[PDB]
Design a binder for these strands. Sequence first.
DNA 1: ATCGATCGATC
DNA 2: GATCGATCGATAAAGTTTTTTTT
Lengths: 112, 634, 461, 56, 222
Amino acid sequence: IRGDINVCLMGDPGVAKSQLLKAICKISPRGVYTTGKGSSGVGLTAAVMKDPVTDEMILEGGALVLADNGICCIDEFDKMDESDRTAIHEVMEQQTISISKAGINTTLNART
Amino acid sequence: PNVSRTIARELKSFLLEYTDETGRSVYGARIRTLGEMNSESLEVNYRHLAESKAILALFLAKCPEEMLKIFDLVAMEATELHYPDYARIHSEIHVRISDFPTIYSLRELRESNLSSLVRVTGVVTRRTGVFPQLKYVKFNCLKCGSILGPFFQDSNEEIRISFCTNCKSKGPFRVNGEKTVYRNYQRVTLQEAPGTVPPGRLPRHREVILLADLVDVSKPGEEVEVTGIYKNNYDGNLNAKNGFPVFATIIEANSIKRREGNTANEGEEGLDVFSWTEEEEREFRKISRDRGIIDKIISSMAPSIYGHRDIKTAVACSLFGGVPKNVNGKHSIRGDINVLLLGDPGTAKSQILKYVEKTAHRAVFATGQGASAVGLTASVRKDPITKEWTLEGGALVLADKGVCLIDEFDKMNDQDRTSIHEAMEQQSISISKAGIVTTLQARCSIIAAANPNGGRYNSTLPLAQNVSLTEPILSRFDILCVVRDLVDEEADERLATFVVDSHVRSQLNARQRRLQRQRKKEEEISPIPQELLMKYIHYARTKIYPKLHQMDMDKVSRVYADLRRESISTGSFPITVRHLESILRIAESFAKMRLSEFVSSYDLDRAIKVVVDSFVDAQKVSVRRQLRRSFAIY
Amino acid sequence: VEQSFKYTEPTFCPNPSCENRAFWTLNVTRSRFLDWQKVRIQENANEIPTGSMPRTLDVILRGDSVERAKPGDRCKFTGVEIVVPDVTQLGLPGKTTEGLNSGVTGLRSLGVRDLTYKISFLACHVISIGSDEINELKEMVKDEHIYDKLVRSIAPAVFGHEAVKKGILLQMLGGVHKSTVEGIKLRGDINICVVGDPSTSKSQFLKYVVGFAPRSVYTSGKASSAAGLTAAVVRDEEGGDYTIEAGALMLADNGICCIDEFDKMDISDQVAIHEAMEQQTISIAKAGIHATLNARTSILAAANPVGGRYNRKLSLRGNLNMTAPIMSRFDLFFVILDDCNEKIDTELASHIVDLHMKRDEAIEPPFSAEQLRRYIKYARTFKPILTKEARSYLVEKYKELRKDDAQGFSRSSYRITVRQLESMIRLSEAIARANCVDEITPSFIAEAYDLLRQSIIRVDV
Amino acid sequence: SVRQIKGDFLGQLITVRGIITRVSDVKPAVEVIAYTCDQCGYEVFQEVNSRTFTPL
Amino acid sequence: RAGDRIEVTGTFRSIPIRANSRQRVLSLYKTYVDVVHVKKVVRQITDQDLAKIREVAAREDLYSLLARSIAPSIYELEDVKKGILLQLFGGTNKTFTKGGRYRGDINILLCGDPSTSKSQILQYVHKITPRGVYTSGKGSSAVGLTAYITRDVDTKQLVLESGALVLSDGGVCCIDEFDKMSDSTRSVLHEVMEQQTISIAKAGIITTLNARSSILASANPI
DNA sequence: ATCGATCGATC
DNA sequence: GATCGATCGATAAAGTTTTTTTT
Ligand SMILES: Nc1ncnc2c1ncn2[C@@H]1O[C@H](COP(=O)(O)OP(=O)(O)OP(=O)(O)O)[C@@H](O)[C@H]1O
């Protein structure tokens, strides 16, 4: 069964409200912060990328493969939505944080 | 050995003493003619090849190349008596071989084919330029005799040694610079053209090494087929696969010819003869001094289609062309004629354009959807891994007389049509997209296959209401051929009883008896057969230039002025300064077919009465009133 | 003799006491060769546990076995194993700890290196799974009603519709293609469609033909974006742009392709296949040189009506749901009608249950599948020519026919012109090509005239 | 800070602050050696130089 | 196989490496383990189970007994529970020698009220079948399903991995989002609905490979 | 700059 | 004729922002 409900906000002040949310996220335990640029929805889960001359094809990731059972505080919901909008459902959809690339088909947990 | 010395005597007899087809010394005539142009080439007739292989099939398919080296030195003496001291210029000749009775594709090569004659087709991809090749390795020692004679270097093997006939030390071999001539070298690599191939699969690669007097005959992109030998070079080094007991492939060539068309022949139209030496040029004058030739040629041009006359007047006039008359330091003059057809969906308009593709010398058939807005003209293909952004043109730079089908590809009509109507207006157009500012020169011709939105009379109103093509691009053409067919009986049978008989048209003597069968199958009513009529268009276009007079001019002055006046108050589509330029242009097109260089009086009113009627006959219900003006021109 | 995996230098036992191992010269004269190729294999689909990067290996084909291995099929092999290293030679200078076993393999008698050993595979022989019978044709050609025997023995999954059963059999065979000299190559086939209400007996023939016909592909023709029906080259990949592509026209070279659902394509391909219909070649110049490819095809179609139910009092000029000149470019149809009667549903119910029995094979087609299949392979080896003077009988029929469909000078542009006269004889020879008669009688073209005419009065109200 | 440590600070002792990035793993380095001949058993010793060396 | 939770009972070793590829020079080592034993974390059909189910097969209410067993927490809703076990009892391949080639597999669907264990029922069906699929939110696509060209990090060559519809050879295709699926795809499932196959038109090769498949659809309102 | 191979000289 | 020493020759390098059609 599902636990760990998710509350969302909306509204357009001129206060730049990230200080009203994410200041809590910068003192809360296991609360990692993200933005629009950088970690996309494919960059939210784990992936295989380039590395230095040492052991390549390591499983680099974003937030949800490392912020399990914590706080995932996000901003800019209309940014990089072609990969984001599916994957944010996949934590509310129970336990399907996975890397279904050509490399492997293993699935890790989802509790955030 | 020594009996091959007699072989040269045994074939110079067997070749030069007699040429077939009632003598005439055919091969004994084409030798001196290519001596006159100073172009270093010869041919061999296949029927002569059929007769000069009886003792030589075991000296062609057994040993192809050293037979040719002793075959080369007899051709000097075959013309040294004819042209004395011809060896003092360029000192060299080598033969070429004509067609062969094999149909090998690229896939079908095995071990049994090597070190023998081969024939294969394909297409030319990425190619290099022209380098010089050393060809005569004057070897050089350091302390002993440093001139070991000019050698005979091979293909990619680097034939050298460490020490021989001077010492046995490790003294390397060097060069010097006295009297080493150079032949050139041009490594076109070949890709299999996707024609006769079981589809849905990949292309396959080869390599072709050209030779001295066969450089840059091909152009990149164009379809070719090559006849040469097969060779091997076991270099013992390859670095895509591992090193293995394998060996590469090199195809050296002896000849090369252009794309061929309608591959169904048995003894002709595969070899580009196009060599109007004696039996043609002595004949071709009396066929030009007759009185109804222009009433005979255009009737007998496209034999398969009976139809209305005026299109065959126009489409024969299109590939005959005019003149690119240059001028002093001022604006140039268009030397092209660009027809445009308009037809009902079901008349023969798709066939005359198909048939004229064969009867031209070079062509292209970019039709319908999929014609890119840039791929017609030149485009830049990006570099490979260590190269530069080079210029690889497509259709229009290759085709000098090209054929497109711009009917109504409406989704891409707003893409490409900004790139074809400046091939005419600002003729010789080229572009500088992210590359080099250059200007290629392409004096191309354009025909078209327009198609209205449904029936031919989709409105009573003018042609801006009929076609979706707007005014100014449409005005870059000269004439609008339009068809009509409502209801008839005796004109209907004149097609109907005609086309039914066309479907009824479905060993040395017997090779020619089949060739004699080829005469009567196109000579039912005998309309001047196409065995030779295409064979003189190629020098009807590159040998004769016409001129005009001045006393036969000012009749046309009121023709342009009054008809423009008669069509502005009644405005369907206008005429400008360029219509009268097309008036005199197609006038001298007809006079080029008299092989005459002049302009008569009979050709002007002929050329007038093919434009004035073909303009007015698409107006309105009120075409009947305009025809009351029409015979004032006549 | 016996050049090994790296022995590019035979340097053993000269005849006299000359300089052994000093040089070599690979003679291209006496050293006989053999021809080979190196391909990769892959594991079959019904054995993978999951998408777990299905590994592979490589083979070598040595003898005549070259080119027998058509790529992309289930296949078997001989089975000799081998291991091949290649690291040190005369020419070019020879992640993780792969080749860790190689450090054991050092210190041979020549120079100290790190020679590996990688597993490979060699084959010798390939296979690819997936009389009186010649006298049986001579007996079966001496029958009488085989034109009527064949039409009853087409498909057990259909009942009735004896008009359209006649047409598909003529499509199943081929016509003629030889034509006039020095110019036009005429039509080579017929092309017939049937429109009707979906989820009916239209879909059964489409199931029937694609196994019954030689190499005939089926494609829905809905992917009108990338490639396939529309022909369009691929982007620059691994060494070049402007490469040819597949699609269900090029591999239908003497193959009978079948596409459906004409309504849902775009407005651009409706001239593209219209180009592909009139003659037998297509042309392309998209960002590369012109291509001269000739897809010798014969299409089969089944579109959808404008509302799913066909009106009766009108013509199909409204209900064709496309433009005008492709229909005139097409042949005629014999549209399948529909009705709800008390009797036909009951007999079709009995017709379907014994079929949908696991085993009720009491229905008897008077031929089998394969003896019909080899029969038309005997039928294609003739060339019947009209020789009688019924062409004078022929021309008056069309001359009467053209004055019917033109109901006025301002009547519609579905005027059946001289384009259809070719089909008016090239079906007329093919029906006589079914009954193995090498010439054309005026009696045989009786079924030829009305076959358009009973279906053009379906057009003309 | 690292912006001004360019000069005479070679072969000396300097503390620098900063931010640690690109942490590698723990790997065994070599400080002594012992080759075995399997005849005499005298395991030969040598010192270790920089990151590449050669046996005897 | 690659991609599972694992435990190993390994010894320890270390190897030298050559710095230059063509000399005997060597010094920062690389370690690796050597495993002695590893651990992750046609069935053998007995006869007591066949005897046990025949007691259940003696019970006439097996339809009702399988009606109540499929829901450990779900509200009753008898009508949806009919076809789900029926599709799981997915017929057989009643195939003739000549003609036909029909298969008894059918296709149910459902749509309607949002989040009525629409996914958890599909998760529950994923429990009851060992070899099946699971759809994703754009995990597969039109070109991302099959027909691959992909430049893999081991050899940079071609690999043809099967799509999920071919991958269910012995299962039930569970698939969703059939109102937000792109119209570049939702065009090849008609072929596996009809000819039970996937036709591949890729630069590699052509293949008419079949797909023994069975589908259900979980749509959504708008 | 170092290592390996080949050639020459000496025993 | 074989072995040892000296001299000469050959062997090690690295990539990933602009621009094209296309969907
Ligand atoms: N006047 C004619 N004489 C002989 N044959 C004809 C004539 N008109 C049509 N045909 C025949 O009709 C066939 C159909 O081709 P047709 O020329 O009608 O295409 P089209 O309607 O011109 O095509 P498009 O409109 O796309 O150019 C041709 O193969 C041709 O042989």
